[PDB]
Amino acid sequence: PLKVEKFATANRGNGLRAVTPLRPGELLFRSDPLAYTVCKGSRGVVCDRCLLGKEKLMRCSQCRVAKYCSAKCQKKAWPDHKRECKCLKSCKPRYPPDSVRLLGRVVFKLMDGAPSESEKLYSFYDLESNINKLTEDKKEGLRQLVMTFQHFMREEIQDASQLPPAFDLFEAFAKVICNSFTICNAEMQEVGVGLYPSISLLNHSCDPNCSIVFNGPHLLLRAVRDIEVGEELTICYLDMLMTSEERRKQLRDQYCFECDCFRCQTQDKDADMLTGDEQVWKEVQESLKKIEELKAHWKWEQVLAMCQAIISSNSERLPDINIYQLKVLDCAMDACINLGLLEEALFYGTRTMEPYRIFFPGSHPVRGVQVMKVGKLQLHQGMFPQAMKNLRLAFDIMRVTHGREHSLIEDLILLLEECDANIRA
Length: 425
Ligand SMILES: C[S@@+](CC[C@H](N)C(=O)[O-])C[C@H]1O[C@@H](n2cnc3c(N)ncnc32)[C@H](O)[C@@H]1O
Ligand SMILES: O=C1Cc2cc(C(=O)NC3CCNCC3)ccc2N1
Ligand SMILES: O=C1Cc2cc(C(=O)NC3CCNCC3)ccc2N1
Ligand SMILES: [Zn+2]
Ligand SMILES: [Zn+2]
Ligand SMILES: [Zn+2]
Known about the structure:
By secondary structure, the protein is α+β, with helices and mostly antiparallel strands. It has helices spanning 71-81, 85-91, 98-112, 136-152, 169-179, 244-255, 262-266, 270-273, 278-296, 300-311, 323-339, 342-359, 365-380, 384-401, 407-423; strands at residues 4-8, 14-18, 27-31, 35-38, 58-59, 67-68, 180-184, 190-195, 203-204, 210-215, 218-223, 232-235. The strands form 4 sheets. Strands 1-2-12-9 form a 4-stranded mixed beta sheet, with no helix packed on it. The protein has a 3-stranded antiparallel beta sheet with strand order 3-11-10, with no helix packed on it. It has a 3-stranded antiparallel beta sheet with strand order 4-8-7. Residues 12-15, 127-128, 130, 178-179, 200-201, 203-204, 255-257, 259 line the site of S-adenosylmethionine (SAM). The site of one copy of the ligand O=C1Cc2cc(C(=O)NC3CCNCC3)ccc2N1 has 4 residues, from loops. It catalyses: L-lysyl(4)-[histone H3] + 3 S-adenosyl-L-methionine = N(6),N(6),N(6)-trimethyl-L-lysyl(4)-[histone H3] + 3 S-adenosyl-L-homocysteine + 3 H(+). Residues 270-425 are annotated as: C-terminal domain.
């Protein structure tokens, strides 16, 4: 017997609930993806299988688009790449939308693949599509995806025979919109997209009681506070650095619902998020469109230059609690880490600590990882009392959000032991 179950909610479809009390940090479920792919910005920078960045990737010789860190990865990937390769070679110097490559892999994984453990609680067939809530604009976008898919797969899929029993491509793309997980690497960089149908049972809250974390493509679902018997299990679908208006847009546009959580009812934190001079934060918000695109493509030198122009502007500056300023600091910190500018990374990272304490309350994996980054930076600069405080705090968080089953916890424990050797009596 599991400690959770599927149930029919009153007004939000199916959900997952606790069938026994759960404690912070408890592992509730784990899953490989039904299907996944590298995301657009990371294609060619990270390995298509393990989603790690390496100096050197080796191209699939047959398509020259899918890239691997190693023979191990090419071989472990081949069953699930074998049918899409031809399709990728034809389209370049051009490339299908991530959703299309993802659905291609679902369609092959269904037909060709043994049944998937990712579907133990809920299957692809069961996923919500929200078809009766889609607007005309969204339906038009789905129709285009269907046409794109039919072109991409004409190579490997011409008729009903190669698509699953009673398969409707329009409905399948509708499912992909509201059930696609962004896969993040250990450093919380977005690197892939996948389907995890059992995890798609979880409804959303802006103040959730569970969290997911990724270790490569593998997903761990954990409780992040005490949960009572019968309580519905929730995760936050969204970035924490968002006002309630911003959250409302994304939840409507992507998920077709109106959030009734208490944070949305109270507009919790909205005004604190937008402190400082409007002329400046409006312009920073605009600049972040470019900065975030550059970051998604791992263009660190360009990210850093744009961020430095803001952080160290000759013109007016923002408080670090302003969410747009905060996002700029965090992009700059990650750019510096990746460029080996570790002193500079620490200045920006340390500035994010208190805002992150405020905006990622309780135990949130993104805060755990940020605090760990800052402690690591301090450790390697010989700032041992500071590092030890931060590494301990990171562990406080990550023992709950990541747990022993996540490899990053082993890395963190090594840092703690290293630092302790310098501060111990
Ligand atoms: C990933 S699925 C979650 C499981 C879903 N309820 C089902 O029956 O398959 C996402 C969809 O669940 C619904 N949903 C999730 N969180 C919600 C919430 N807090 N309030 C209302 N509907 C919600 C929406 O239909 C949304 O598009
Ligand atoms: O069924 C689904 C699909 C889905 C996707 C996400 C999701 O990918 N959220 C992202 C993660 C990276 N930062 C921005 C927000 C979170 C929860 C969820 N449940
Ligand atoms: O095996 C099982 C299945 C199961 C279901 C539930 C259950 O449905 N609990 C309710 C939900 C609403 N509030 C009060 C509690 C509670 C306990 C339990 N043990
Ligand atoms: Zn690899
Ligand atoms: Zn190939
Ligand atoms: Zn909400």
